[model samples]
Target: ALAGTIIAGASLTFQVLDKVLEELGKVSRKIAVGIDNESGGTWTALNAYFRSGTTDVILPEFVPNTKALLYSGRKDTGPVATGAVAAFAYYMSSGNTLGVMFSVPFDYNWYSNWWDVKIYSGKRRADQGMYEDLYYGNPYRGDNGWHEKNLGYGLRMKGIMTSAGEAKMQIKISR
Candidate 1:
């Protein structure tokens, strides 16, 4: 999943989890990426951090409609935690945007010293509101190991984290 699936260029799609059940929720859900700050508190620093490097990636929203270049930056834009990198991918995915994040924090001592991946809804960019939801409002919380989410409409998300010399958080979305 490291190499972006270079689809023959698109208009095709990833449809159906069989059916959509409105009684449960929309076709999208939210997740967040965060780490413990020097103060021993949760810090969703990647939001604005990505904002700094708001340049571009190829996150497929759909076939052919997939040429949308994402706007964001890297985590090394300042005097931040080195190599504690986090990345987010954006996709249109129907009415709302499907956002995913992978966070690998280098600081291995804080209370929340675990790595994680999160999912988010809407066209909301990397911002404060997104940070709060993922950090607090998210129900899909965890420490490490593989985790999967079955979003509506056959959309499935997979997240896994490993703690070696540096934290590694990996995420993937599929039908």
Candidate 2:
């Protein structure tokens, strides 16, 4: 009788194993994507600070058929917090002609600081294409160069404007 009980237990164990394997095979497979992911999701963009005279915003990780737009608008460009500064719209686009246009309005005294901006491909800031100078022109702390902001994912703009200029970038991930 004991020998028969052991045989029955082994048969139940083998049946359980067979059921588990069958369930695993019936499982479905899936692929997911995010804003900055390589091969999924809609177009993504964000805000980045660029210093004056600094050129070329590169995106090394960018896939084919991508777009980048760098826009600069005034944010009090001045020595005083309550100074008179008009909002001017200046923008450049990649995947197109290199020549750009600017229609900014301001005076020399209110120059406040040097301003620069550019648009590049890719989402990650790991290469030479995605870098900031923090301090480029003056001896003052945090003086110049294209300064990158701590902008998070999903194309939102906040506190990214610096030195009377700012950037809004757009990238297409699908193709």
Candidate 3:
């Protein structure tokens, strides 16, 4: 009986190994990268992916001679959290006038899951909007830019604003 049990265990282990190998063979390619834009100008091509159509995307432009940094990763969300097997780009801006843009996929469900919160100084001009208008043929409407999604999961946010003393924009994602 012991011999029979050992044989069954070995057979199961071999079967599991074979199945794992088979699945590994079907896995697709994954990519991730980080960019530091301290010198500042414009880096048009950062990264891209293809599905049914060519989904080309670009990193935020480093406005002239300002302090701007961009970092991205695949499968890893960031220093604070972990998420699905997805790609993420984190952009940071400081000094003079600050601005940043991250083009996340609509399928990410960010709009519904979390409300995008933007805290900025009302003293300065801030452009708070999504970039889908440029690529998806959405007409340019100035007032339509600042729309917040506050429902379902939580509040996810992004924006630009000025501070009286330091000029800061706090983009927070919370539940």
Candidate 4:
């Protein structure tokens, strides 16, 4: 029952919940925004079950029309809300661009979930197409050079984590 949101000019925040319990537990996301969540959006990331890919997420109620900010490119369902980032940053707070919530990162047959993070100047989404590419589009596994490091705006994925049995992540947002 922990959660924090992104707000331009604001600080970073964290939280965990929603979408699953008896099923796959659920995929979790977060932010860093050292680059806090004060003014613009906070940092971002995703953790899903094996191959549970998705570029879309259920934004909070106060987030207004999240469709105007987040968009999933699954099934060629591109740009649910046209306008774009440069033109849509207003909806993202002030210094925020766009975030991508990928499907899977590292999920073996007997393990937990692992996902990285990414930032863009708007125009982004997480669908099967991109997720598949992450796993099969390169020589190194889950090494897009963005995860576990800063992407310039204070966004970072830290390291890929996994648990033996399903349980609460007890996430921590450190400095």
Candidate 5:
């Protein structure tokens, strides 16, 4: 039947599938996921957005670990797309065992939208162990202090650079 084909195709390399499998055991651990607000990060965040708050877990990986995951996804940064196979494991599970995909999606009124700012600040942040606020600055302020601007930055792929607003994300989960 169709289920057999899915099960067969689901057979992935242990390394790639480890992210999926590992999510199965821990429901509250801050799993180090994607690089940006999208891709790996989206998979982790959508858990919160889509599941109606059923998934409650924070994700934080060391700079080295984040680099490894990003390198595997072949993604550098910004609102880039990577992969979501790891999320499939969560969607395909059952019972009190729940799962979710989380992401940043759009750049809201936070702070430091510059690529270099994100980089320099992120590194300094990691070094200082002030990681929770790395992805977002301060949504409560405005102006250099301007916490509500995206800096109109763009990604240059194929001799093209477009604003980060062009980035969009989606995730699906089931109990």
Candidate 6:
């Protein structure tokens, strides 16, 4: 039950849950970090985590109105959340293994606009296409990668993790 929140400026202060998963590295054996709580607008908190320098691997649930940010294609359109360093780490991740919790809440302001989401796939190779008019991928980083998942389908999210230290984070998801 350890949590620490900070005020970057004026908007929502990122509150990070520390001890809640303190020895999480030990339990999971992957030295991983994740946002496993219910979406309660902890956008900044998740961002604060990177400063802790506890572990490299992180797992956080999607922010409250991530869809709005996606559609607007800018952070100012919504909130300058997602902490500080965490957002920076996202850009540095080469594997593109980060995951975002995707789904429309119900009658939120950005519900309809949620259709404009971008998924980053690291699997795309140079020979895949694009240059020869093979594929006109989305506009962002323009990686134009591809992958597979179970979600119904909408925007593409980069999987910001790959090598989980083998025996550190072991989560058994059942269908």
What is the C-alpha lDDT profile of model 2 across 1-175, one tens digit per residue?
Answer: 1110111111222233223223322212100101111222222233222222211222222222222222222223334232211111111122211111121223334444332222233333222222232123221111323233222232221111123222121112222
Stronger candidate by TM-score (3 vs 5): 5
From the highest TM-score down, the ranking of the candidates is 1, 4, 5, 6, 2, 3
Model 2 C-alpha RMSD to native: 24.3
What 10-residue stretch in candidate 6 is worst by lDDT? 67-76
lDDT of 5 by residue, 1-175 (tens): 1110112112222333334324434222112222222112112111212211122233222222112112111112334332111121111111111121222223334421121112121112122122223223422211122112222122110101112322111111110
Please state the error at residue 94 of candidate 2 in Å. 21
RMSD of each: 14.3, 24.3, 21.5, 10.9, 17.1, 17.2
Each model's lDDT comes to 0.33, 0.22, 0.24, 0.27, 0.21, 0.21
Q: Highest TM-score among the candidates is held by which one?
A: 1
Off by over 4 Å in 1: 1-89, 112-122, 139-144
- Give me the runs in candidate 2 sitting further than 4 Å from their true place: 1-41, 44-65, 70-103, 113-144, 154-175
What's the C-alpha lDDT at position 84 in model 3? 15
Q: Decide which is better by TM-score, 1 or 4.
A: 1
Query: Which regions of candidate 4 are displaced past 4 Å?
Result: 1-57, 61-91, 94-112, 133-147, 157-160, 165-175
In Å, residue 73's CA in model 3 sits off its true spot by: 5.8
- Can you write out model 3's per-residue Cα lDDT over 90-138, one digit (the tens) per residue? 2222222222222222233332111122222222222223222222332
In candidate 2, position 159 carries an lDDT of 14
TM-score of each: 0.46, 0.20, 0.19, 0.37, 0.21, 0.20
Per-residue error for 69 in candidate 5, Å, reads 2.4
- How close to the true structure is residue 5 of candidate 5, measured as C-alpha lDDT? 12
**Between prediction 2 and prediction 3, which has the larger lDDT?**
3
